[PDB]
Every structure is written in C-alpha cells, then in structure tokens.
Amino acid sequence: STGSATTTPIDSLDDAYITPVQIGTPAQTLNLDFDTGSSDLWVFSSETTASEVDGQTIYTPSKSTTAKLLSGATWSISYGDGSSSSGDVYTDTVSVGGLTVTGQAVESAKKVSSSFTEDSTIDGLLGLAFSTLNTVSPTQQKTFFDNAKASLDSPVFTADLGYHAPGTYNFGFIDTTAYTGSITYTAVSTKQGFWEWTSTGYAVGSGTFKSTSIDGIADTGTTLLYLPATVVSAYWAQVSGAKSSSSVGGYVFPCSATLPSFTFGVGSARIVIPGDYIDFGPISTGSSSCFGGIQSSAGIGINIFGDVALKAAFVVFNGATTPTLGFASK
C-alpha cells in the first residue's frame, strides 16, 4: 500500500504545516501537524476542556463506530517550545492520503496548553519519530508509520515541504519526479528516539564550505533551523545590522535586508536554503526588525534541522531495519 497527502502552511510565514487526516467511522477529518520530532498522535476532542478549545476541529469518539477506549491508558507530553497536552486514549481507524491503519492509538486531549488553544489551525499532532518516544502509559503505543510500515510497498515516508506553498507527505514510495539529481542517504542514530544524523558542514552565501560535523535531528514539527552558536554567528555576521536580541529571544535583522543563502552538507552533497526562506518577518506588527530563521541551539541541547532546512529538500525517512535519511535538491 501507499498514501499521499498534501501538507499546507498554516500562515504566510510557514510557521507550521497541516495535513488532513481521517479518523473514525464515519470519517472525521482533522488537520494535524505531522511531527518527525515526536511520537504521539493526539487530537483536540469532545473531551478537551471547553475553555481550551478556540476554533479547532474536534474528534468525537462517541460518534465513531470503530472507536474503542484503550482502558487505563493516559498520555502527557511536553514539547521543546514549552507547550504541552495530556489526556486519555482510544484506538480507531486512521487514514492519511488513502493509507489506512486500523487500531491506531488516537490520544484524546483533556488539556492543552495556551499555545495550542491560540492556534485555531492545528487540530492536533501526528508523530513520526520513533515509537520509543511515545508517551502513552502504562502500555506504550506505536506511531502511524510504525503501524503502517509492514503493509507499505517500501518502509519509507517522504517530506516535501513547500516554501510559502503546499507540499506533500508520501508513505510507502519515493516519487522520482519530486526532486532533481540524486538522493544522498546518510546514517541515523535512533538512540534518542529521533531521526538524528550528522551534517558534514555548511556555507554562508557564496562563501567557502566549512567541513565540520553537525549532529542534529530532522524535525518537521520545528519551524526554524537551530545550529551551534558559532555557525549561527557566522551566518548573521553577513547581514548588516543583524544582532542577537535577548529581549526578542534570538537573532533579528533589518527588514530591509537581502539575506544570504545557507548551505548544509549531506555527505558529499549540498542542500542550499535560499535567503528568503530565512526571513520570518516583523517581530511585531509594523516593526522594521525582522526575526531570523536560523537561530542558536545553545541551551536547547540538540541541533534541529526544522522546516527552514527541510523545505529546501526532498527528504526520505527510511524506516528499514537500519533506518537512514535521504536528502535531494528539488
């Protein structure tokens, strides 16, 4: 089997991407944030505290003839941005782009933190990291991909995120028309439960490539590119007037600037992030200070190849017995 679904930016900045997901019988379609940095499929629901729902579409398990309470199971997750959610668990039929999993754990939120409430466009998350990170207790549950894997034509999924445009998540096949050149594959460590890999270096604009190992995670659920402070300083030094602002919480730059590209290495291959991809717009409405899309990972404890980086590539999440990652230009 295969599946193919379009993923759409939630706003004009590509702050996140939503993908429609069918849950239950008859189908209830929710727009979920596919997150290769976590491993829980959780949704706003009829159980979510009413004051914490503000425009999201909710899953109502009592209206699904295939929903079953997973007795005794609870979940609770905290994300790197400080947001969180928790609740109980049903199993139900879940379909993505024509690919169907029966008995998928659907984690129903009883509580969500303010940032989830405040984002009316995201109805929940669909985790695509390794199932060892799933938070369900006392019986850990599998991700959608883990449950589908054996049925897929090939044990892979691909992320093809757009810049200011829709893109595609495919399951079970590699669309050879969706990228240019060849796909370069690179080793993955699953020791932390992430799609963790080592970039071979970087370049800023037209500058020379610096060969240096950068361990980080391919994380579709993180908006920006978080890299070591040395690398990030080297990038922003090429932008007149750019500075790190403690009060804003990262590097800012004059909105009048033209930003240089940023290249990262994948083995001997190179992925070029155009400068425009690194502009996240005014820090507040009407400001001429703009927020940068490359930020320091110092204090986060891990480097994160988030959407800024991934959207410049066609990315293969290869879930073979020994997982690997593939990157192609597009």
Q: Are residues 149 and 181 in the same domain?
A: no
Q: Are residues 142 and 201 in the same domain?
A: no
Q: Are residues 38 and 168 in the same domain?
A: yes
Q: Are residues 96 and 166 in the same domain?
A: yes
Structure tokens at 116: 């989830």
Number of domains composing the chain: 2
Residues contacting 299, CB < 8 A, separation 6+ = none
Q: Are residues 150 and 181 in the same domain?
A: no
Tell me which residue range forms the domain holding 291: 175-330
Which residues is 251 bridged to in the sheet?
244
Amino acid found at 294: I
Residues contacting 272, CB < 8 A, separation 6+ = 261, 262, 263, 312, 329
Q: How far apart are CA 283 and CA 294, in angstroms?
A: 14
**CA distances to 159, 226, 299, 303 from 276, in Å:** 20, 17, 26, 21
Is residue 241 within 8 Å of residue 257, measured between CB atoms? Answer: yes
Is residue 144 within 8 Å of residue 317, measured between CB atoms? Answer: no
Q: Is 131 a catalytic residue?
A: no
Q: Is 329 a catalytic residue?
A: no
Structure tokens at 147: 């449950």
The one catalytic residue in 35, 88, 123, 146 is: 35
Residues contacting 301, CB < 8 A, separation 6+ = none
Q: Are residues 230 and 297 in the same domain?
A: yes
Residue of 190, 186, 215 whose CA lies nearest to 201: 215
Q: Are residues 279 and 205 in the same domain?
A: yes
Structure tokens at 67: 């929903």
CB atoms within 10 A of CB 242: 20
Q: Are residues 303 and 205 in the same domain?
A: yes
Long-range pairs for 18-22 at CB < 8 Å and ≥24 separation? 18/121, 18/122, 18/123, 19/96, 19/126, 19/169, 21/94, 21/95, 21/96, 21/126, 22/93, 22/94, 22/95, 22/96
Which residues is 28 bridged to in the sheet?
23
Q: Are residues 157 and 31 in the same domain?
A: yes
Structure tokens at 41: 């499929």
**CA distances to 203, 211, 234, 261 from 238, in Å:** 12, 19, 7, 10
Q: Are residues 139 and 233 in the same domain?
A: no
The method of structure determination was X-ray
Structure tokens at 310: 């991934």
Structure tokens at 287: 């400001």
The one catalytic residue in 108, 131, 199, 261 is: 199
3-state SS, the chain, equals CCEEEEEEECCCCCCCEEEEEEECCCCEEEEEEEECCCCCEEECECCCCHHHCCCCCCECHHHCCCCEEEEEEEEEEECCCCCEEEEEEEEEEEEECCEEEEEEEEEEEEEECHHHHCCCCCCEEEECCCHHHCCCECCCCCCHHHHHHHHCCCCEEEEECCCCCCEEEEECCCCCCCCCCCCEEEECECCCCCCEEEEEEEEECCCCCEEEEEEEEECCCCCCEEECHHHHHHHHCCCCCCEEECCCCEEEEECCCCCCCEEEEECCEEEEECHHHHEEEECCCCCCEEEECEEECCCCCCEEECHHHHCCCEEEEECCCCCEEEEECC
Q: What is the CATH number of the domain that holds 139?
A: 2.40.70.10
Terminal CA-to-CA distance of the chain, rounded, Å? 25
Where a domain ends, among 174, 196, 224?
174
Is residue 103 within 8 Å of residue 125, measured between CB atoms? Answer: no
Structure tokens at 275: 């400068």
Q: Are residues 140 and 225 in the same domain?
A: no
Q: How far apart are CA 17 and CA 121, in angstroms?
A: 9
Q: How far apart are CA 9 and CA 18, in angstroms?
A: 6
Q: Are residues 301 and 244 in the same domain?
A: yes
Residues contacting 50, CB < 8 A, separation 6+ = none
Where a domain ends, among 139, 159, 174?
174
Residue of 197, 34, 192 whose CA lies nearest to 128: 34
Where a domain ends, among 120, 146, 174?
174
